Amino acid sequence: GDFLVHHAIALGLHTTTLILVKGALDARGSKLMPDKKDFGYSFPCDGPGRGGTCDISAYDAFYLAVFWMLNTIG
């Protein structure tokens, strides 16, 4: 029974680290928003254009990664 729970903890850690590393690496510029370095760090979004751009700033990845941090530590 410790096997399963250690693997659940590994899932939580890898997912939180995924969210954080993704928010960090796609910071200077991503393929959807190439000039992300111009709007700083914590901006709401880049507008409803281009099929929808919601929670695209790295601050939002940190948002979701804090959700997963709560889950993993729980």
Partner 1 sequence: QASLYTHHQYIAGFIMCGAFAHGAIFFIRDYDPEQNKGNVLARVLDHKEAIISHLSWVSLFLGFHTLGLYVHND
Partner 2 sequence: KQPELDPDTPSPIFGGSTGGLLRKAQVEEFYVITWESPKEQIFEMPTGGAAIMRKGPNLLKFARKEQCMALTTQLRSKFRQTPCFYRVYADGKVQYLHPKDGVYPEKVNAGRVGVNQNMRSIGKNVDPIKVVKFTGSEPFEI
Partner 3 sequence: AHVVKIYDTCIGCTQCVRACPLDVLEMVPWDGCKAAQMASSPRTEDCVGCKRCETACPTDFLSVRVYLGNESTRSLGLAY
Q: Does 1 bind partner 3 (CB under 8 A)?
A: no
Q: Which two tokens stand for residue 7?
A: 């693997």
Which of 2, 17, 32, 45 touches partner 1 (CB under 8 A)?
17
CA–CA separation, 36 vs 43, rounded Å?
10
Contact 56, 38 (CB under 8 A): no
Which of 9, 55, 67, 73 touches ligand CLA (CB under 6 A)?
67
CA–CA separation, 34 vs 59, rounded Å?
17
Residues in contact with partner 3, shown as a per-residue x/- string from 14 to 53 under the rule CB under 8 A: --------------------xx--xx---x--xxxxx---
